Amino acid sequence: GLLSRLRKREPISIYDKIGGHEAIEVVVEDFFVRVLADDQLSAFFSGTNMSRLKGKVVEFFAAALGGPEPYTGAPMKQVHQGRGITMHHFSLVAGHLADALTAAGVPSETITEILGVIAPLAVDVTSG
């Protein structure tokens, strides 16, 4: 936990400074409200079990940002390959994530930092 980590002189992760698992859950739920309300994006999710997807995305984001929870989903490249996702769609999704973070009161500098973790994933997510 954050307390145990501080006793061990480990620096505070992005996961911990934004509020850990509960913060991420709330952000991911809001993120998908936004993504599914966006008609440039909704159709990508037409065949998707959304409770399941959100579960996996919480796990992925938590792990990417320094959380201790395992990611129990499939590899990014495999999942996204062939879905005709361009950098335009990736960027829109990134926008909605930034919006969800903003809505949750995450400081803008920390959102930028998170975007810097997430942006390089576009390589695995997009077709081009």
57 binds ligand CYN per the rule CB under 6 A: yes
DSSP sequence for 14-48: HHHHTTHHHHHHHHHHHHHHHHHH-TTTGGGGTT-
The site partner of 57 among Na ion, a second copy, ligand CYN, none (C-beta below 5 to 8 Å per kind) is ligand CYN
With CB under 6 A as the contact rule, the residue among 13, 19, 21, 44 that binds ligand HEM is 44
Residue 60, interface with ligand HEM (CB under 6 A)? Answer: yes
> Could you tell me the smallest distance in angstroms from the CB atom of residue 78 to Na ion?
6
* Side-chain half-sphere CA neighbours of 114 within 13 A: 29
Binding residues (CB under 6 A) for ligand HEM: these are 41, 44-45, 47-48, 53, 56-57, 60, 73-74, 79-80, 83, 85, 89-90, 93-94, 118, 121, 125
